[PDB]
C-alpha cells in the first residue's frame, strides 16, 4: 500500500556484473542497515568472470558501492598424494547472498573442483562454495560441504552412491536464527539436491586458508534418495525456515524441489535431522512450483504461513487454452499437530511470460495494521513486459486476493525487476519497513522507502 | 570431546593374530580417515596405514602388506588393526590417530595399546 | 618414501628459553606438516598442522614455520610442561613418514 514509488533510491554496479542477481540487508553490529548485492558475473583478477559481492551504505542519493573483497585466486594443493584443484571461473559469487548477525555469507554454486592422483580423477565438477566475512574484523571463511577426494571410478563402482560432486552448494541459502548456516545443493547427489548445514561459529572456527579439504563436525548433511520421484527434482533449489511443528526449540526447513517427481513440483517441510514433516505437490508439471517459497505470519495468529511459487503456471482461458502467467499459493498453519491442508488463496499472474511467483518477499507489516503483508514479484509482467512487484496485504482470513499496490519497473525492458527482493527491514530508521528490489539484467537495484499511509 | 580409547595391553605367542580395537568417543567413527601408527624406541615411529570407516578403503605402507589389516565397524563407532604372523618386531606401541580439521593430518591420539610377542 | 631428518636428537634446555626444533625433509612437502608432543610415559597430542596452524587447546608459545623442505617448530619461554619428546611428520605423500624425534631435558 504505502511504499513510495516516486522517490526511489538506485545503487548500481559494473556493466555486465548482474549486480542484483541476490541482495539482502545487512545490520553492523552497531544495527546501522546496509545493503548486501551479489554480481555473479563481476570480472576477476584474469578479465575472467568469477562474481563479486558488494556491501552498500544507506544513503537516499544511492550510487556506487564498495567491494567486499573475497580470495578470487585458482587454489592448488599436493597432498595425500593426490592434488587437489579449485576452480573459480564463472563460479557466480554472489549468486546467492544472505546476512546474519554481523557475518555475510556469499555463494558461488558453480565453483568447480577437482582431485587429481596420477592419471585419474575424481572430475572436474560444480561443488560449489560459499565466501563468509564478518567485515568490521576483516575475519574470513569459506564452506565447501561437497568436495571430496574420492576418484571417478570409485562411484563407477559403487553405483554413484553419495555422489555429491555436481551439489552447487550455495545456490540457495538461509541462516536459522541461532546461527545455522543451511544449503541449498540442487544438483547434490546426482542432481536429486541436497541440504547442507554447519554452525557459522564452527565454519569460521574449522576453516585455515590453503586447506581445501577439511572437516566441520557439527556439519549435517541431507540424503540420497533410491526413489525416482526424487530424480532429477532439484531439492534446494529454493530454501527457508520457520516454525511449523509447534516446539520452539526447534527449528524446521522448507525446501523447493521444483522438478519433483517428473517436474510436478514440490515443496516439503522437515525437521533439522531432514526427517520430512509434510510435503506439498505442484499442481501442474512444468509449472517450477518451489521456485521460490516464503515463511512468514500473514494472518496474525502467531503461526508461520508458507507461500509458495510456481513462476510457470499456465492459467487456463476461454476455448480449452493456456496461458503462462505463474501463480502463488498460501498455506495458512493450522492449530495444533496438524497436516497444512489445500492452499487457503491461489494469486494467479496477469501479463503472459511475466513469471509471477518468481520472488516472494515477506514485507513484516508495511501498512502498520498488525499483519504481515507480502511482495510477489512477476520480472516481465506488466503491461509493458518491464516486471512488476505486487503487494498483498495480511489479514485475519490470510491474505487479501488484490494486490494493495503494484511498483512497475523503472528500469529499460530486459532487466528482469524483481527477480530478487528483500523487505522487512527499516533502512532509514522511520519506523516502517522497507524493500530493496533486484534487477540484475540493469546492474541495479532500487529502494522502495515505506511512508505513512496516505 | 573427542577421545580415542584403545584396547588393553596384548600379550600373545609368536605366530599368533591379535585385533586391537579403537573406539570413538564424542563424535562418528565415520566422520574423519583413522590412522594406525607404530612405535619401538629405537625404530621410532611408524606409519601403518589408514582406512576411511564410511567406506572400509584402506591404504598401507607395503613395508605392513600382509601383516596389517585395518576395518571398522561404525555401528560399534571402532577401528580395528589386526596382525598377523606375530614376531619380536611386531613387539610395540600401537595408536589409532584422526586429524582435527585437515583432512590429511594427524592430530588426535589415542592413548597406545601396548603389544609383547613371546614365547 | 620421504625422509624426514629431524634435529637435534636431544637439547639441554631451561625455563624460560626460546628453543627451535628443525625437520629437514628429502623432497618439498609444501608445508604438508605436523608437529607432534609425547610426554613421558604419556600418549601423543598434536601441536601443529598444514605448518603453521596450532592445534586447538595448544597455547601459542608453540610456532610452526618453514616452506619447501625445511620447516621448524619453536616454543618460546618453556614452561616446566614442555620437557618432551617432540616428531614432526609429513603428509604430503603416501606413505607418511616421521623425523626420529627431539627430547628436550633439563640442563643443569
Known amino acids: 500500500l504505502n511504499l513510495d514509488p516516486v522517490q526511489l533510491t538506485f545503487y548500481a554496479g559494473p556493466n555486465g556484473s548482474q549486480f542484483g542477481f541476490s541482495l539482502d540487508f545487512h545490520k553492523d553490529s552497531h544495527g546501522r542497515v546496509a545493503i548486501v548485492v551479489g554480481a555473479p558475473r563481476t570480472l576477476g583478477p584474469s578479465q575472467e568472470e568469477t562474481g563479486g559481492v558488494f556491501l552498500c551504505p544507506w544513503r537516499a542519493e544511492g550510487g556506487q558501492c564498495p567491494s567486499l573483497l573475497f580470495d578470487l585466486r585458482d587454489e592448488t594443493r599436493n597432498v595425500g598424494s593426490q592434488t587437489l584443484q579449485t576452480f573459480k571461473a564463472r563460479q557466480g559469487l554472489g549468486a546467492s547472498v544472505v546476512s546474519w548477525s554481523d557475518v555475510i555469507v556469499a555463494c558461488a554454486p558453480w565453483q568447480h573442483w577437482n582431485v587429481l592422483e596420477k592419471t585419474e580423477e575424481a572430475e572436474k565438477t560444480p561443488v560449489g562454495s560459499c565466501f563468509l566475512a564478518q567485515p568490521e574484523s576483516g575475519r574470513r571463511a569459506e564452506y565447501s560441504p561437497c568436495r571430496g577426494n574420492t576418484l571417478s571410478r570409485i562411484y563407477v563402482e559403487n553405483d554413484f552412491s553419495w555422489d555429491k560432486r555436481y551439489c552447487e552448494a550455495g545456490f540457495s541459502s538461509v541462516v536459522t536464527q541461532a546461527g545455522e548456516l543451511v544449503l541449498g545443493a540442487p544438483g547434490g547427489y546426482y542432481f536429486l539436491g541436497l541440504l547442507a548445514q554447519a554452525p557459522v561459529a564452527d565454519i569460521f572456527s574449522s576453516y585455515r586458508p590453503g586447506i581445501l579439504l577439511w572437516h566441520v563436525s557439527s556439519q549435517s548433511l541431507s540424503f540420497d534418495s533410491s526413489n525416482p520421484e526424487y530424480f532429477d527434482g532439484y531439492w534446494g533449489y529454493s530454501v527457508a525456515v520457520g516454525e511449523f511443528d509447534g516446539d520452539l526449540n526447534t527449528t524446521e526447513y522448507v525446501v523447493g524441489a521444483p522438478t519433483w517427481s517428473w517436474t510436478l513440483g514440490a515443496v516439503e517441510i522437515l525437521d533439522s535431522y531432514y526427517q520430512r514433516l509434510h510435503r506439498l505437490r505442484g499442481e501442474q508439471m512444468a509449472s517450477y512450483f518451489g521456485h521460490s517459497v516464503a515463511v512468514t505470519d500473514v494472518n496474525g495468529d502467531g503461526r508461520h504461513d508458507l507461500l509458495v511459487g510456481a513462476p510457470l503456471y499456465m492459467e487456463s482461458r476461454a476455448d480449452r487454452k493456456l496461458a503462462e502467467v505463474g501463480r502463488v499459493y498460501l498455506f495458512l498453519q493450522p492449530r495444533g499437530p496438524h497436516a497444512l491442508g489445500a492452499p487457503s488463496l491461489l494469486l494467479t499472474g496477469t501479463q503472459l511470460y511475466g513469471r509471477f511467483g518468481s520472488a516472494i518477499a515477506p514485507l513484516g507489516d508495511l501498512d502498520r495494521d498488525g499483519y504481515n503483508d507480502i511482495a510477489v514479484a512477476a520480472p516481465y509482467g506488466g503491461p509493458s513486459g518491464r516486471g512488476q512487484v505486487l503487494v498483498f496485504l495480511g489479514q485475519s482470513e490470510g491474505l487479501r486476493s488484490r494486490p494493495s499496490q503494484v511498483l512497475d519497473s523503472p528500469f529499460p525492458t530486459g532487466s528482469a525487476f524483481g527477480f530478487s527482493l528483500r523487505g522487512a527491514v527499516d533502512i532509514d530508521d522511520n519506523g516502517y519497513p522497507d524493500l530493496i528490489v533486484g534487477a540484475y539484467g540493469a546492474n541495479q537495484v532500487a529502494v522502495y522507502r515505506a511512508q505513512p499511509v496516505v | 570431546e573427542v577421545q580415542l580409547q584403545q584396547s588393553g595391553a596384548e600379550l600373545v605367542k609368536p605366530g599368533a593374530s591379535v585385533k586391537l580395537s579403537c573406539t570413538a568417543s564424542?563424535?562418528?567413527?565415520?566422520?574423519?580417515?583413522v590412522h594406525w601408527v607404530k612405535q619401538r624406541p629405537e625404530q621410532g615411529l611408524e606409519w601403518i596405514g589408514r582406512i576411511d570407516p564410511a567406506n572400509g578403503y584402506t591404504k598401507y605402507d607395503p613395508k605392513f602388506q600382509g601383516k596389517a589389516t585395518i576395518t571398522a565397524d561404525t555401528s560399534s563407532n571402532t577401528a580395528y588393526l589386526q596382525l598377523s604372523s606375530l614376531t619380536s618386531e611386531d613387539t610395540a606401541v600401537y595408536y589409532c590417530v584422526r586429524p582435527l580439521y585437515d583432512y590429511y593430518a594427524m592430530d588426535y591420539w589415542g592413548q597406545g595399546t601396548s603389544v609383547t610377542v613371546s614365547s | 618414501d620421504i625422509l624426514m631428518t629431524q634435529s637435534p636428537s636431544s637439547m639441554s634446555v631451561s625455563l624460560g628459553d626460546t628453543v627451535s626444533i628443525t625437520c629437514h625433509a628429502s623432497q618439498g612437502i609444501s608445508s604438508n606438516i605436523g608437529w607432534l608432543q609425547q610426554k613421558p610415559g604419556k600418549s601423543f597430542m598434536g601441536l601443529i598442522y598444514?605448518?603453521?596452524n596450532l592445534v586447538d587447546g595448544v597455547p601459542s608459545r608453540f610456532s610452526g614455520s618453514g616452506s619447501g623442505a625445511d620447516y621448524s617448530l619453536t616454543i618460546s619461554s618453556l614452561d616446566s610442561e614442555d620437557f618432551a619428546d617432540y616428531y614432526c611428520?609429513?603428509?604430503?605423500?603416501?606413505?607418511?613418514?616421521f623425523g626420529g624425534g627431539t627430547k628436550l631435558e633439563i640442563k643443569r
Open positions: 611428520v609429513q603428509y604430503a605423500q603416501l606413505p607418511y613418514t
Open positions: 598444514y605448518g603453521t
Open positions: 564424542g563424535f562418528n567413527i565415520k566422520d574423519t580417515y
